[PDB]
Amino acid sequence: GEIGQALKEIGKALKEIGYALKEIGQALKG
Amino acid sequence: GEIGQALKEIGKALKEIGYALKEIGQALKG
Amino acid sequence: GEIGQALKEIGKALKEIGYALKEIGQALKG
Amino acid sequence: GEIGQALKEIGKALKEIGYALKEIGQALK
Amino acid sequence: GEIGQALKEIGKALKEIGYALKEIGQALKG
Amino acid sequence: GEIGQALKEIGKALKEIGYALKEIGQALKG
Protein backbone atom coordinates (compact mmCIF):
# COMPACT_ATOMS: atom_id res chain seq x y z
CA GLY A 1 0.00 0.00 0.00
CA GLU A 2 0.84 3.70 0.05
CA ILE A 3 2.28 3.87 3.57
CA GLY A 4 4.09 0.53 3.41
CA GLN A 5 5.81 1.39 0.14
CA ALA A 6 6.84 4.75 1.58
CA LEU A 7 8.30 2.97 4.62
CA LYS A 8 10.23 0.57 2.38
CA GLU A 9 11.86 3.55 0.63
CA ILE A 10 12.79 5.01 4.01
CA GLY A 11 14.32 1.66 4.96
CA LYS A 12 16.30 1.68 1.73
CA ALA A 13 17.63 5.18 2.45
CA LEU A 14 18.66 4.06 5.96
CA LYS A 15 20.60 1.08 4.60
CA GLU A 16 22.37 3.51 2.26
CA ILE A 17 23.22 5.73 5.20
CA GLY A 18 24.53 2.71 7.09
CA TYR A 19 26.66 1.79 4.11
CA ALA A 20 28.10 5.30 3.91
CA LEU A 21 29.00 5.14 7.60
CA LYS A 22 30.91 1.87 7.00
CA GLU A 23 32.85 3.63 4.23
CA ILE A 24 33.65 6.45 6.63
CA GLY A 25 34.84 3.84 9.14
CA GLN A 26 36.95 2.18 6.46
CA ALA A 27 38.47 5.56 5.52
CA LEU A 28 39.36 6.31 9.15
CA LYS A 29 41.10 2.91 9.28
CA GLY A 30 43.44 3.97 6.46
CA GLY B 1 -2.36 11.32 1.12
CA GLU B 2 -1.28 13.42 4.06
CA ILE B 3 0.76 10.67 5.71
CA GLY B 4 2.15 9.17 2.49
CA GLN B 5 3.45 12.52 1.24
CA ALA B 6 4.96 13.36 4.64
CA LEU B 7 6.81 10.03 4.60
CA LYS B 8 8.01 10.81 1.06
CA GLU B 9 9.63 14.03 2.25
CA ILE B 10 11.30 12.12 5.09
CA GLY B 11 12.61 9.69 2.49
CA LYS B 12 14.11 12.58 0.51
CA ALA B 13 15.75 14.12 3.59
CA LEU B 14 17.28 10.72 4.41
CA LYS B 15 18.66 10.36 0.86
CA GLU B 16 20.22 13.81 1.24
CA ILE B 17 21.78 12.72 4.54
CA GLY B 18 23.24 9.72 2.71
CA TYR B 19 24.70 11.91 -0.02
CA ALA B 20 26.34 14.18 2.55
CA LEU B 21 27.85 11.18 4.39
CA LYS B 22 29.14 9.87 1.06
CA GLU B 23 30.94 13.18 0.50
CA ILE B 24 32.38 13.13 4.04
CA GLY B 25 33.75 9.63 3.43
CA GLN B 26 35.28 10.70 0.14
CA ALA B 27 36.88 13.75 1.78
CA LEU B 28 38.36 11.59 4.55
CA LYS B 29 39.57 9.02 2.01
CA GLY B 30 41.33 11.69 -0.05
CA GLY C 1 -3.67 16.11 11.62
CA GLU C 2 -1.82 14.84 14.69
CA ILE C 3 0.30 12.27 12.83
CA GLY C 4 0.88 14.31 9.66
CA GLN C 5 2.07 17.37 11.58
CA ALA C 6 4.32 15.19 13.75
CA LEU C 7 5.81 13.66 10.61
CA LYS C 8 6.37 17.17 9.23
CA GLU C 9 8.38 18.11 12.36
CA ILE C 10 10.43 14.94 11.94
CA GLY C 11 11.06 15.95 8.33
CA LYS C 12 12.31 19.36 9.42
CA ALA C 13 14.66 17.79 11.96
CA LEU C 14 16.18 15.57 9.26
CA LYS C 15 16.68 18.60 6.99
CA GLU C 16 18.69 20.22 9.78
CA ILE C 17 20.75 17.05 10.31
CA GLY C 18 21.47 16.94 6.55
CA TYR C 19 22.54 20.57 6.64
CA ALA C 20 24.88 19.99 9.62
CA LEU C 21 26.49 17.09 7.76
CA LYS C 22 27.06 19.28 4.68
CA GLU C 23 28.71 21.81 6.99
CA ILE C 24 30.97 19.07 8.38
CA GLY C 25 31.91 17.92 4.89
CA GLN C 26 32.60 21.48 3.75
CA ALA C 27 34.87 21.96 6.76
CA LEU C 28 36.71 18.71 5.99
CA LYS C 29 37.30 20.01 2.44
CA GLY C 30 38.54 23.40 3.64
CA GLY D 1 -2.43 9.64 21.30
CA GLU D 2 -0.14 6.63 21.33
CA ILE D 3 1.31 7.10 17.86
CA GLY D 4 1.60 10.89 18.04
CA GLN D 5 3.43 10.73 21.38
CA ALA D 6 5.86 8.14 20.02
CA LEU D 7 6.51 10.40 17.02
CA LYS D 8 7.13 13.37 19.32
CA GLU D 9 9.72 11.28 21.16
CA ILE D 10 11.35 10.41 17.83
CA GLY D 11 11.49 14.10 16.97
CA LYS D 12 13.07 14.74 20.36
CA ALA D 13 15.74 12.13 19.62
CA LEU D 14 16.37 13.79 16.25
CA LYS D 15 16.90 17.16 17.97
CA GLU D 16 19.63 15.67 20.15
CA ILE D 17 21.29 14.09 17.12
CA GLY D 18 21.27 17.51 15.43
CA TYR D 19 22.77 19.01 18.52
CA ALA D 20 25.56 16.40 18.70
CA LEU D 21 26.35 16.96 15.02
CA LYS D 22 26.77 20.68 15.62
CA GLU D 23 29.19 19.90 18.45
CA ILE D 24 31.08 17.59 16.08
CA GLY D 25 31.29 20.40 13.53
CA GLN D 26 32.79 22.75 16.12
CA ALA D 27 35.16 20.05 17.41
CA LEU D 28 36.54 19.87 13.85
CA LYS D 29 37.41 23.58 14.18
CA GLY E 1 0.07 -1.67 20.17
CA GLU E 2 2.08 -3.08 17.30
CA ILE E 3 2.88 0.29 15.74
CA GLY E 4 3.38 2.15 19.02
CA GLN E 5 5.91 -0.39 20.25
CA ALA E 6 7.72 -0.43 16.91
CA LEU E 7 8.00 3.35 17.02
CA LYS E 8 9.25 3.20 20.61
CA GLU E 9 12.04 0.85 19.48
CA ILE E 10 12.87 3.32 16.71
CA GLY E 11 13.08 6.15 19.24
CA LYS E 12 15.32 3.92 21.37
CA ALA E 13 17.74 3.28 18.48
CA LEU E 14 17.82 7.02 17.70
CA LYS E 15 18.73 7.81 21.30
CA GLU E 16 21.58 5.31 20.97
CA ILE E 17 22.68 7.06 17.77
CA GLY E 18 22.71 10.33 19.73
CA TYR E 19 25.03 8.90 22.40
CA ALA E 20 27.32 7.43 19.78
CA LEU E 21 27.68 10.86 18.14
CA LYS E 22 28.52 12.39 21.55
CA GLU E 23 31.33 9.87 21.94
CA ILE E 24 32.61 10.72 18.44
CA GLY E 25 32.55 14.39 19.39
CA GLN E 26 34.56 13.59 22.51
CA ALA E 27 37.09 11.45 20.63
CA LEU E 28 37.52 14.35 18.19
CA LYS E 29 38.31 17.11 20.69
CA GLY E 30 39.93 14.62 23.07
CA GLY F 1 1.27 -6.47 9.57
CA GLU F 2 2.64 -4.58 6.60
CA ILE F 3 3.35 -1.36 8.51
CA GLY F 4 4.62 -3.00 11.70
CA GLN F 5 7.06 -5.20 9.79
CA ALA F 6 8.27 -2.23 7.75
CA LEU F 7 8.86 -0.32 11.01
CA LYS F 8 10.83 -3.24 12.45
CA GLU F 9 13.11 -3.22 9.40
CA ILE F 10 13.56 0.52 9.93
CA GLY F 11 14.39 -0.08 13.59
CA LYS F 12 16.96 -2.69 12.55
CA ALA F 13 18.54 -0.32 10.02
CA LEU F 14 18.83 2.31 12.78
CA LYS F 15 20.50 -0.19 15.13
CA GLU F 16 22.95 -0.91 12.32
CA ILE F 17 23.64 2.83 12.00
CA GLY F 18 24.25 3.14 15.74
CA TYR F 19 26.69 0.27 15.54
CA ALA F 20 28.66 1.80 12.66
CA LEU F 21 28.89 5.07 14.61
CA LYS F 22 30.35 3.21 17.60
CA GLU F 23 32.97 1.73 15.26
CA ILE F 24 33.80 5.22 13.97
CA GLY F 25 34.13 6.49 17.54
CA GLN F 26 36.37 3.58 18.52
CA ALA F 27 38.55 4.22 15.45
CA LEU F 28 38.87 7.92 16.36
CA LYS F 29 40.30 6.86 19.73
CA GLY F 30 42.97 4.50 18.40
Residue numbers in the entry:
A (entry chain B), B (entry chain C), C (entry chain D), E (entry chain F), F (entry chain A): 1 to 30
D (entry chain E): 1 to 29
Text lifted from the article:
Next, we crystallised and solved an X-ray structure for a 4-bromophenylalanine variant of CC-Type2-(LaIdGe)4. To our surprise, the asymmetric unit contained two distinct and strikingly different α-helical hexamers: an open, C6-symmetric barrel; and a closed, C2-symmetric sandwich with a consolidated hydrophobic core. To a first approximation, both structures have two three-helix sheets with similar helix–helix interfaces and KIH interactions expected for Type-2 coiled coils. The main difference is that the two α-helical sheets of the open state are related cyclically to give the C6 symmetry; whereas, those of the closed state is sheared perpendicular to the central C6 axis, to give a C2-symmetric bundle. As a result, in the latter, the aliphatic residues form a compact hydrophobic core. However, relative to the open barrel, the remaining chains of the closed state are rearranged significantly with average translations in the paired helices ‘3’, ‘4’, and ‘5’ of 5.92, 6.98, and 6.05 Å, respectively. We propose that the introduction of Gly at e’ in CC-Type2-(LaIdGe)4 perturbs this balance. The lack of side chain allows the helices to pack more closely together. This is apparent on closer examination of the structures: in the open state, the Cα atoms of the Ala-13 residue at g sites of neighbouring helices are spaced regularly at ≈9.3 Å; whereas, in the closed state the average distance is ≈8.8 Å. The helix–helix–helix angles are all ≈120˚ in the open state but vary between 90˚ and 150˚ in the close state.
